[PDB]
RNA sequence: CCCCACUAUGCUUAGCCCUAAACCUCAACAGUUAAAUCAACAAAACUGCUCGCCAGAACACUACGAGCCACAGCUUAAAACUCAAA
């Protein structure tokens, strides 16, 4: 299916970041994935401190990899990212653009519930 | 029979159903700016739908996106990211007297 | 512990008015439910007891909001008697 | 050739008005209690409007005024009630006086 | 400019100053308001301890420590030792809902310190350790 | 414990107690009058008597 | 009952045990709101069809028999004596 890899990389110089991305995209292809696009979301301060591979991180490079892969590649890729020392945090989710949003007519009002109690005099 | 008798039909004056501010829009966990508009600035607590004004479907979408974004490294948990404090105030809550 | 400090639950004092800053902070923590949450967490509330409390609190909200809605609806009728003497 | 009730109802101004929310109507003050003006505007129920602060003395019994209607009858069903509670008055906003 | 209750964010260029010091440079008064005691420690922005006072160190014992006046006395004592070390403005970080939560802050002010901000850091577990069983009273 | 040296502080405490003594006398009057209250339970119950909730059919 | 300390235990894995006010004490499916609405209370009153279950209290979540990884257990489950009530 179509997946989205949300990849937070260690803050590095341009050469080491390109080597990490190439090494990560090749890992996807080695597992049978068809990589569709690579998006750079920019280097930013993390929302909190993240400890990864005996190091503390406060900034990271946010990248996205849109790709298709067999269902068995996800588990194998997650294991690969856990060993890459230049990856702070990597998560694979089902691509949000696959889920088609159903149409909505609006808010249907809810009337106050009726006949909850008998009408006998108490 | 008679021309002036009422005729059966649907209410012509019926108003269109109201929609939430996010009706028809995609809620992504990477759009931290939008998600930040539905958490407390001081505590990061997700606002209930009585504060956000969202429909049930979008209250769930926002909630699930926030929880995903927080643990994936996109959004803080204990406070609203200060970068997003000057965004439009869409929630119905006032903390200053 | 891993987050930045002096952002969460932080209120700045204006013109040395520490009372108003503390009241604002207490109002913030109260509205977000933290004060009541801290109190309920001092001793363990068993799940059966928590479910009963939530049911009681939800039924109280419905009753209180419906009584308030009726009070506001009838308040206009609190005007002086237009037909006094009849 | 006697007009039927169905005909009277179809061609009545109250029928032709449609929904009452945000409709401008002409009312007449028929009863006054202190600064509460009781105004009939052609509906089942009168509305009660407070005397405006400006030109309050111009509003007297018989004075015709302009109203913006909100509801012809204020009614609501409350928790546990079997029927709707009615206050037996219309909801309207007093705009001013009508003059020629 | 209008007043902002939100604290200045470190790394941005704010105009607020206190004795020529930025918000990130103001010392911190850590108040631990427990149910049976109140502890106050003033530290520098670099985490250097400057003064410590608690209801117990001010000569209160047993239930008297868990009072507002006991915390107020601890605040004055901590303020006095901190003022000698050059402290005027402090950032208050209070954790706990004890009786000396607010009184400890008053004592810091009566002792000559100016509170520029108040921070709550009461630990709230998001799901955490199981607390002790309820009391039968 | 010499009152001669603590005059200003004593006069403060004395005035503060007097203000709190009068304040209770003020509050009590305004509480019964309802000057600050949204409505008095007594007044708010006479209004409900006129529009009683009807959980039964008539 | 209140305070402190600490164990079995609450967790995981692999097997047992098979019990709860396991109760929303309101069976499944289909249907109705009219007639008589209806002991009381509770969560208005009923029809069709089917399975399960019940027939004074207590003895009795007991005895015996039988089955079961259960061996101070579980399930099924009586009788005698006693009472005019429960
Ligand atoms: S009202 Fe349409 S999605 Fe919310
Ligand atoms: K039950
Ligand atoms: Mg143990
Ligand atoms: Mg676990
Ligand atoms: Mg159960
Ligand atoms: Mg049963
Ligand atoms: Mg069955
Ligand atoms: Mg029997
Ligand atoms: Mg048993
Ligand atoms: Mg047995
Ligand atoms: Mg046996």
3-state secondary structure B49-87: HHHHCCCHHHHHHHHHHHHHHHHHCCCCCCCCCHHHCCC
Q: In chain B, which residue's Cα lies nearest the Cα of A108? A: B17
The one-character DSSP state at C83 is T
Point out the nucleotide closest to A116 (alpha carbon to C1′).
G43
The Cβ of residue F55 has, within 10 Å, a number of other Cβ atoms equal to 16
Q: Chain D residues with CB inside 8 Å of F51's CB? A: 85, 87
Measured CA to CA, the distance from residue C11 to residue C28 in angstroms comes to 9
Distance A104 CA to ligand 11 centre (A): 66
Q: Are C66 and D79 in contact (CB under 8 A)?
A: yes
Question: Can you tell me the distance from the alpha carbon of D95 to that of E15, in angstroms, rounded to the nearest whole number?
Answer: 50
Q: Could you give the CA distance from residue C45 to residue C42 in angstroms, rounded to a whole number? A: 9
E28-33 and E89-95 beta bridge pairing:
parallel
Q: Report the CATH superfamily, name and number, of domain A2-94.
A: Ribosomal protein S6/Translation elongation factor EF1B (3.30.70.60)
- Is any atom of strand G within 7 angstroms of residue E136's beta carbon? yes
Please, how many CA atoms are within 13 Å of residue C45, restricted to the half-sphere of its CB?
14
Which tokens hold the place of B52?
């956000």
Tokens of E52: 């410590």
Structure determined via:
cryo-EM
Please count the structural domains in chain B.
Answer: 1
Would you mind telling me the total number of residues written for chain B in this entry?
Answer: 97
- Contact assessment for residue A119 and residue F57, using Cβ atoms and an 8 Å cutoff: yes
- B15 CA to centre of own chain: 21
Contacts of F57 (CB under 8 A, 6+ apart): A119, D82
Could you say which residues 6-65 of protein chain E have a Cβ atom less than 7 A away from any atom in strand G?
none
- Chain A residues 91 to 120 whose Cβ lies within 7 Å of strand G are 115-118, 120
Chain C residues within 8 A of B78 when measuring between CB atoms: 3, 8
- Indicate if CB(E135) is under 7 A from strand G: yes
Contact yes or no for A64/A5 (Cβ under 8 A):
yes
Resolution in A: 2.9
CB contact under 8 A, F39 and C71: yes
Are the beta carbons of D80 and A117 separated by less than 8 Å? yes
- Is F1's Cβ below 8 Å from some Cβ in D? no
Distance from CA of A118 to the nearest CA of D (A): 10
Among residues E102, E93, E117, E114, which one has the least CA distance to residue E68?
A: E102
Residue B26 forms contact with E (CB below 8 Å): no
A113 touches chain C (CB under 8 A): no
Ligand 1 neighbourhood includes A104 CB (under 6 angstroms) = yes
The residue range of the domain holding B59 is: 2-97
Contact state of A117 with D79 under an 8 Å Cβ cutoff: no
Interface probe for C, chosen from E98, E117, E137 (most Cβ of C below 10 Å), is E117
Contact C8, B44 (CB under 8 A): yes
Contact assessment for residue D75 and residue D55, using Cβ atoms and an 8 Å cutoff: no
User: Is residue F57 exposed (0-12), middle (13-18) or buried (19+ Cβ within 10 Å)?
Assistant: exposed
């Amino acid at each position: 299916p179509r997946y989205e890899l949300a990849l937070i990389l260690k803050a590095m110089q341009r050469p080491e970041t390109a080597a990490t991305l190439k090494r990560t995209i090749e890992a996807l292809m080695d597992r049978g994935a068809i990589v569709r696009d690579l998006e750079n979301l920019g280097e930013r301060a993390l929302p909190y401190r993240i400890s990864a591979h005996s190091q503390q991180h406060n900034r990271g490079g946010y990248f996205l990899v849109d790709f298709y892969a067999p269902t068995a590649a996800v588990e194998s890729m997650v294991e690969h990212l856990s060993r890459d020392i230049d990856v702070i945090r990597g998560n694979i989710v089902k691509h949000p653009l696959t889920q088609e949003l159903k149409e909505c007519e609006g808010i249907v009002p809810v009337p106050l519930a009726e006949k909850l109690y008998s009408t006998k005099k108490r | 029979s008679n021309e002036d008798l009422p005729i059966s039909m649907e209410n012509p004056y019926k108003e269109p159903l109201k929609k939430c501010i996010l009706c028809g829009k995609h809620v992504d966990y990477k759009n931290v700016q939008l998600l930040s508009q539905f958490v407390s600035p001081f505590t990061g607590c997700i606002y209930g739908r009585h504060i956000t004004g969202l429909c049930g479907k979008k209250q769930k979408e926002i909630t699930k996106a926030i929880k995903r974004a927080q643990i994936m490294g996109f959004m803080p948990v204990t406070y609203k990211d200060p970068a997003y404090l000057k965004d439009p105030k869409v929630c119905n809550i006032r903390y200053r007297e | 512990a891993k987050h930045l400090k002096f952002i969460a639950r932080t209120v700045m004092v204006q013109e040395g008015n520490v009372e108003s800053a503390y009241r604002t902070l207490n109002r913030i923590l109260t509205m977000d439910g933290l004060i009541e949450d801290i109190k309920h967490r001092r001793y363990y509330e068993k799940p059966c007891r928590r479910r009963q409390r939530e049911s009681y609190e939800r039924c109280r909200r419905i009753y209180n909001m419906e009584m308030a809605r009726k009070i506001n609806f009838l308040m206009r009728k609190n005007r002086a008697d237009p037909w006094q003497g009849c | 050739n006697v007009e039927s009730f169905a005909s009277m109802l179809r061609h009545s101004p109250l029928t032709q008005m449609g929904p009452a929310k945000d409709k401008l109507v002409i009312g007449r003050i028929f009863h006054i209690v202190e600064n509460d003006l009781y105004i009939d505007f052609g509906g089942k129920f009168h509305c009660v409007c407070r005397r405006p602060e400006v030109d309050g003395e111009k509003y007297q019994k018989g004075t015709r005024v302009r109203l913006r209607l909100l509801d012809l009858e204020l009614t609501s069903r409350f928790l546990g009630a079997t029927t709707d509670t009615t206050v037996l008055e219309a909801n309207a906003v007093l705009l001013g006086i009508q003059e020629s | 400019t209008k007043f902002s209750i939100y604290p200045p964010i470190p790394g941005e260029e704010s105009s607020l100053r206190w004795a020529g010091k930025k918000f990130e440079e103001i010392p911190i008064a850590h108040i631990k308001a427990s149910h049976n005691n109140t502890q106050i420690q003033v530290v520098s922005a670099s985490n250097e301890p400057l003064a410590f006072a608690s209801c117990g160190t001010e000569g209160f014992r047993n239930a008297k420590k868990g009072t507002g006046i006991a915390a107020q006395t601890a605040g004055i004592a901590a303020a006095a030792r901190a003022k000698q070390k050059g402290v005027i403005h402090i950032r208050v970080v209070v954790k706990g809902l004890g009786p000396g939560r607010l009184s400890a802050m008053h004592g810091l002010i009566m002792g000559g310190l100016e509170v520029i901000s108040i921070t709550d850091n009461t630990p709230i577990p998001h799901x955490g350790c199981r607390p002790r069983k309820a009391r039968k009273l | 414990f010499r009152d001669d040296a603590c005059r200003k502080e004593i006069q403060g405490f004395l005035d503060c107690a007097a203000r709190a003594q009068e304040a209770r006398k003020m509050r009590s009057i305004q509480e019964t009058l309802g000057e600050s209250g949204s409505l008095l339970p007594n007044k708010l119950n006479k209004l409900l008597q006129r529009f009683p909730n009807k959980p039964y059919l008539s």
